[PDB]
Every structure is written in structure tokens, then in C-alpha cells.
């Protein structure tokens, strides 16, 4: 029924609100709170390992909160563990980078990072200017579309719930979950007159891979660096 589709939309939004780490209103309220030049210089003078370690902890924390998101979605716990692991492996870092747009301010090209807004410059010590620039771009393109909370909650669910990921054992059970979300998302977009937004979405697979690679690298090499 119509209210049944409406139920699932509000419940995906609920699950998103509960697992999104920081509230949008807090993020929006803190736009004026910007790192000073002194504070920028502090981050830039950190060792490459110090800065990577911090950001990998954040990236890790983000992935865990996407897992919590997935756990609350309708049929996810009912899938076999193998499928749960396949969907989250293939999908979580992409969800993380889409969530990231909410902490991005497109007016001043800054992002909320450890309690204040800062630009690309903050992340010089990472030694990956191109990756940082690309992620800022992706965030900029996402913010421009001016997602509702519902749009993000539903779109990120669809990033996860995908019956096309290699190595599922129960494709059909994923397909039903994916279709149900598609049906719900389609109704919501139609009633809001937002059908066209998903045509405009910037490519996220490559970037997410590189974030995932870096996370893997830091854990792999942790014994050649100071105790965490």
C-alpha cells in the first residue's frame, strides 16, 4: 500500500538519523567555526604517519556506522552472513563518501574535520593532494543537488542493497530488498518532483577504492610505526 511504502521511507530515514554520527543541524551550525591559519599549520606540520593514522581511524569509524545502518535495514539481518559481508564490502566506503557531503560546505570549499571546518590545505601531510581534491569535488557535486535527508538515506541504502555484487549466495533475496527500496525511492522522488537527480550523480567507485586501499595499507604496515 501507499502507507506501506511510506513506512519504509521513514524507517530508512530513522535508521540513517540514528547511525549518521553527527546531526546535520550541528554540522550546519558550526559552519562559522573555521580552523585558524595557526591551526592549519599545526595539521600540516604533522608527520605523514600521524595524519594518516588519524584519518584512517575516522574512515574506520565511518565504516562501522555504515554497518550499523545496514543492520537496521529491513531484511539485512535475514540474509546469510556471507551476503551481508559481500554487500558491505562492495558498498560501505562509497556510502561513507556520500555521507561525507553533509559535512561539506560548498560556499567556502571546506569540510567538518575534528571539530572545525577546514579546506584541502589541512590535509597536506597525507601526501595525496589529488585524492583530497577529488573527494572535495565529489562532495561539492553532491551538495549542489541539495539532497533531502530522505534522499540520502534512501540512496545510500540502494548503494548497499545491490543484487549484482559478485559472490552472493542468495541473489533473489537481495533482489527483492533492492526492488522494494527502488519502488519506495521512486514514489518519493515522483511526489517531490525529484526524478532527475540521480542522473546527475558523480562517479564514486574509484575514489572509495582508493580510500579502502589506504585503510588496508595502514593496518598492513602498523608494526613499522608507533603503537596505536
Amino acid at each position: 500500500s501507499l502507507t506501506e511504502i511510506e513506512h519504509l521511507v521513514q524507517s530508512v530515514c530513522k535508521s540513517y538519523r540514528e547511525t549518521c554520527q553527527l546531526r546535520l543541524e550541528d554540522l550546519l551550525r558550526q559552519r562559522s567555526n573555521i580552523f585558524s591559519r595557526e591551526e592549519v599549520t599545526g595539521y600540516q606540520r604533522k608527520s605523514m604517519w600521524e595524519m594518516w593514522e588519524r584519518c584512517a581511524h575516522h574512515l574506520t569509524e565511518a565504516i562501522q556506522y555504515v554497518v550499523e545502518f545496514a543492520k537496521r535495514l529491513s531484511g539485512f539481518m535475514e540474509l546469510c552472513q556471507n551476503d551481508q559481508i559481500v554487500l558491505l564490502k562492495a558498498g560501505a566506503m562509497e556510502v561513507v563518501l556520500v555521507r561525507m557531503c553533509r559535512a561539506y560546505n560548498a560556499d567556502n570549499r571546506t569540510v567538518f574535520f575534528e571539530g572545525k571546518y577546514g579546506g584541502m590545505e589541512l590535509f597536506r601531510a597525507l601526501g595525496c593532494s589529488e585524492l583530497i581534491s577529488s573527494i572535495f569535488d565529489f562532495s561539492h557535486s553532491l551538495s549542489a543537488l541539495h539532497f533531502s535527508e530522505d534522499e540520502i538515506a534512501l540512496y545510500t541504502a540502494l548503494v548497499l542493497i545491490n543484487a549484482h555484487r559478485p559472490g552472493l549466495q542468495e541473489k533473489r533475496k537481495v533482489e527483492q530488498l533492492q526492488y522494494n527500496l527502488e519502488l519506495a525511492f521512486h514514489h518519493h522522488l515522483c511526489k517531490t518532483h525529484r526524478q532527475s537527480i540521480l542522473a546527475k550523480l558523480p562517479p564514486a567507485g574509484k575514489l572509495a577504492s582508493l580510500c579502502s586501499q589506504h585503510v588496508e595499507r595502514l593496518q598492513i604496515f602498523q608494526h613499522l610505526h608507533p603503537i596505536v
Binding site: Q64, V67, Q81, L88, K89, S209, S212, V215, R217, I220
Partner: peptide, 15 residues
Amino acid sequence: TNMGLEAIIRKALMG
């Protein structure tokens, strides 16, 4: 297919 992420995700799925 990255093994770093799988470990985080496995650990997170418990409990």
C-alpha cells in the same frame, strides 16, 4: 575486494 575493509566489517557485524 579489499581484505582490510572485510576485517572491520566482520568485527562490526558481531553483537
